[PDB]
Enzyme design. Structure first.
Site, short mmCIF file in Angstrom:
data_model
loop_
_atom_site.label_atom_id
_atom_site.label_comp_id
_atom_site.label_asym_id
_atom_site.label_seq_id
_atom_site.Cartn_x
_atom_site.Cartn_y
_atom_site.Cartn_z
N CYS A 1 11.73 34.50 41.33
CA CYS A 1 11.30 33.50 40.36
C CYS A 1 9.87 33.70 39.86
CB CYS A 1 11.44 32.10 40.98
SG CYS A 1 10.84 30.78 39.93
N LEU A 2 9.70 33.70 38.54
CA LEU A 2 8.37 33.78 37.95
C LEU A 2 7.73 32.40 37.79
CD1 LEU A 2 9.01 36.56 35.33
CD2 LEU A 2 7.51 36.70 37.37
N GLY A 3 8.54 31.34 37.87
CA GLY A 3 8.03 29.98 37.68
C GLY A 3 7.62 29.33 38.98
N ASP B 1 15.50 22.35 33.98
CA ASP B 1 16.58 22.12 34.94
C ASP B 1 16.38 22.71 36.32
OD1 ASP B 1 18.96 20.58 35.36
OD2 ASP B 1 20.10 22.48 35.40
N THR B 2 15.13 22.84 36.77
CA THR B 2 14.90 23.37 38.11
C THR B 2 14.14 22.34 38.94
OG1 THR B 2 12.91 24.58 37.40
CG2 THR B 2 15.03 25.80 37.35
N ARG C 1 25.58 22.78 34.70
CA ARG C 1 26.51 21.77 35.21
C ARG C 1 27.33 21.23 34.02
NH1 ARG C 1 21.76 20.96 37.15
NH2 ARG C 1 21.49 19.31 35.57
C1 HEM Z 1 12.35 24.53 42.22
C2 HEM Z 1 12.16 25.24 41.10
C3 HEM Z 1 12.80 26.61 40.80
C4 HEM Z 1 13.72 27.31 41.50
C5 HEM Z 1 14.42 26.91 42.82
C6 HEM Z 1 13.97 28.55 40.78
C7 HEM Z 1 14.86 29.54 41.18
C8 HEM Z 1 14.98 30.78 40.61
C9 HEM Z 1 15.88 31.84 41.06
C10 HEM Z 1 16.84 31.74 42.26
C11 HEM Z 1 15.70 32.91 40.24
C12 HEM Z 1 16.41 34.28 40.38
C13 HEM Z 1 17.72 34.30 39.61
C14 HEM Z 1 18.48 35.60 39.81
O1 HEM Z 1 18.13 36.41 40.70
O2 HEM Z 1 19.44 35.84 39.01
C15 HEM Z 1 14.67 32.55 39.28
C16 HEM Z 1 14.21 33.37 38.28
C17 HEM Z 1 13.38 32.96 37.26
N1 HEM Z 1 12.77 31.73 37.11
FE1 HEM Z 1 12.75 30.25 38.56
N2 HEM Z 1 13.17 28.59 39.65
C18 HEM Z 1 12.44 27.41 39.63
C19 HEM Z 1 11.50 27.03 38.68
C20 HEM Z 1 11.24 27.77 37.55
C21 HEM Z 1 10.44 27.33 36.44
C22 HEM Z 1 9.76 25.96 36.37
C23 HEM Z 1 10.39 28.31 35.51
C24 HEM Z 1 9.68 28.34 34.15
C25 HEM Z 1 9.27 27.27 33.46
C26 HEM Z 1 11.18 29.42 36.04
C27 HEM Z 1 11.33 30.62 35.42
C28 HEM Z 1 12.04 31.68 35.93
C29 HEM Z 1 12.14 32.95 35.26
C30 HEM Z 1 11.50 33.38 33.93
C31 HEM Z 1 13.02 33.80 36.13
C32 HEM Z 1 13.50 35.22 35.81
C33 HEM Z 1 12.93 36.36 36.66
C34 HEM Z 1 13.71 37.62 36.34
O3 HEM Z 1 14.92 37.54 35.99
O4 HEM Z 1 13.11 38.71 36.46
N3 HEM Z 1 11.69 29.06 37.28
N4 HEM Z 1 14.26 31.25 39.51
C1 LIG Z 2 19.23 30.72 38.09
C2 LIG Z 2 18.04 30.06 37.39
C3 LIG Z 2 17.53 28.89 38.25
C4 LIG Z 2 16.96 31.09 37.07
C5 LIG Z 2 15.98 30.30 36.19
C6 LIG Z 2 16.88 29.26 35.48
C7 LIG Z 2 18.29 29.62 35.94
C8 LIG Z 2 19.37 28.58 35.67
C9 LIG Z 2 18.53 30.99 35.38
O1 LIG Z 2 19.38 31.25 34.34
C10 LIG Z 2 17.71 32.01 36.10
#
Ligand code: HEM
Ligand SMILES: CC1(C)[C@@H]2CC[C@@]1(C)C(=O)C2
Ligand SMILES: [K+]
Length: 405
Positions: A348-350, A242-243, A177
């Site tokens: 998502c891995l998180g 930021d999630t 943002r």
């Molecule tokens: C409400 C909480 C969250 C939402 C809605 C969210 C959403 C997402 C989404 C939509 C993606 C896929 C992005 C794409 O396809 O380009 C993603 C990937 C990922 N997220 Fe989350 N996320 C959240 C929390 C977190 C947290 C807390 C972490 C780590 C501290 C995290 C780590 C990651 C990682 C490492 C990926 C990469 C997977 C890959 O590219 O193979 N996320 N997330």
């Molecule tokens: C789209 C996301 C929510 C996902 C984890 C953080 C984020 C901003 C990314 O760059 C991948």
């Protein structure tokens, strides 16, 4: 503010939606994006905003495109183009096959087994933060809980000092943002400037923190490079900062405005996991995208190699074609369809950490502060971008109606 229309794009598909400042923002950010799902709007539109790009407006298309990494590549996954080009985080800037080997390493630091090592500390911090606010009868929820709870857990996990939060949070927010003071490239480089000395230090003298584990990790049996480690750690910081931070504020705003839903979870606490899922659908908040790898006809529309397409994760679950009465929150909804945590190979891995933080927050907040409302005369303002959020969430309550555990 409107880029010239490319020769291959027909006028009847032009809908100048601005993902960083959508026109209907005052209605709520989900509501503002949902204008793309009005009956007269095609499944696939072109906006001239933010450099010009496609937008898939319906779950069917969003899911299809996330599955088809051969046509829809993650190499340039952010709009505007300059941001997508600079974006080089791992695994998110990679397509299969190369992407996949990095997921296992990321799982070692943010996946389910880790959420387990963190369980007690997550619970303890939520309770302590909420108890501290409870007797006050008011809080600024974004700064007082939504930020410090997930961010302090992440900083613990990553072995980073809490006094570094303001700087890191500022940089992360410029990637999702931007306030205009920094390009994505400048923010990303500042983040790497931070991470560079730390990664070096923890490759020399490994600890047990997430940065040490990534920096000393193996990917499919060979050592990770310092620079792959940097590109993974940058992503983990953005996910940590930021999630969930933003999602908690959408959820708490909703609960402040809906005593009936609060009462449901207080009376039937076993419903909290299902409520978490329904809130993840209703207040979905991410929208990134892909770049076309070739000319491609998709749902009767001619896409050209190099065109960007925004594939809003937010939109699938709000689509009436996926969930009836989609703006209505129903904790008993039988099939909660959404792509809130993404779709396809980049799921998502998180998400396990995120769900734990959400569920702990819902339980521990409603245990102590069952009865609360939006502050008198406050109008809650949202903000839109790659990840959407809540600018401020002033809450009030009568301390006499609260419970110290
Ligand atoms: C409400 C909480 C969250 C939402 C809605 C969210 C959403 C997402 C989404 C939509 C993606 C896929 C992005 C794409 O396809 O380009 C993603 C990937 C990922 N997220 Fe989350 N996320 C959240 C929390 C977190 C947290 C807390 C972490 C780590 C501290 C995290 C780590 C990651 C990682 C490492 C990926 C990469 C997977 C890959 O590219 O193979 N996320 N997330
Ligand atoms: C789209 C996301 C929510 C996902 C984890 C953080 C984020 C901003 C990314 O760059 C991948
Ligand atoms: K890139």
């Amino acid at each position: 503010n409107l880029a010239p229309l490319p020769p291959h794009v027909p006028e009847h598909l032009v809908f100048d939606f601005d993902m960083y400042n959508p026109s209907n923002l005052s209605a709520g950010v989900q509501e503002a994006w949902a204008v793309l799902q009005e009956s007269n709007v095609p499944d696939l539109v072109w906006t001239r905003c933010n450099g010009g790009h496609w937008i898939a407006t319906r779950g069917q298309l969003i899911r299809e495109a996330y599955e088809d990494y051969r046509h829809f590549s993650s190499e340039c996954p952010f709009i505007p183009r300059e941001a997508g080009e600079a974006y080089d985080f791992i695994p998110t800037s990679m397509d299969p096959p190369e992407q996949r080997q990095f997921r296992a390493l990321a799982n070692q630091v943010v996946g389910m087994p880790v959420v387990d090592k963190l369980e007690n500390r997550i619970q303890e911090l939520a309770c302590s933060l909420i108890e501290s606010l409870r007797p006050q009868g008011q809080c600024n929820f974004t700064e007082d809980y939504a930020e410090p709870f997930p961010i302090r857990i992440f900083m613990l996990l990553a072995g980073l000092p809490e006094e570094d939060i303001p700087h890191l949070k500022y940089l992360t927010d410029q990637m999702t943002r931007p306030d205009g003071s920094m390009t994505f490239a400048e923010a990303k480089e500042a983040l790497y400037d931070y991470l560079i000395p730390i990664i070096e230090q923890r490759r020399q003298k490994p600890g047990t923190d997430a940065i040490s584990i990534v920096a000393n990790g193996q990917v499919n049996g060979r050592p990770i490079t310092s620079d792959e480690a940097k590109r993974m750690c940058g992503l983990l910081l953005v996910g940590g900062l930021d999630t969930v931070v933003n999602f908690l504020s959408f959820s708490m705003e909703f609960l402040a405005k809906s005593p009936e839903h609060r009462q449901e979870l207080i009376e039937r606490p076993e419903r909290i996991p299902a409520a978490c899922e329904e809130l993840l659908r209703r207040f979905s908040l991410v929208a990134n995208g892909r770049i076309l790898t070739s000319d491609y006809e998709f749902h009767g529309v001619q896409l050209k190699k190099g065109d960007q397409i925004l594939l809003p994760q937010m939109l699938s679950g709000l689509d009436e074609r996926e969930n009836a009465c989609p703006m209505h929150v129903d904790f008993s909804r039988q099939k909660v369809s959404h792509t809130t945590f993404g779709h396809g190979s980049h799921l998502c891995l998180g998400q396990h950490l995120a769900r734990r933080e959400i569920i702990v927050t819902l339980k521990e907040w409603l245990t102590r502060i069952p009865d609360f409302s939006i502050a008198p005369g406050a109008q809650i303002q949202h903000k839109s971008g790659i990840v959407s959020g809540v600018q401020a969430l002033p809450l009030v309550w009568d301390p006499a109606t609260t419970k110290a555990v």
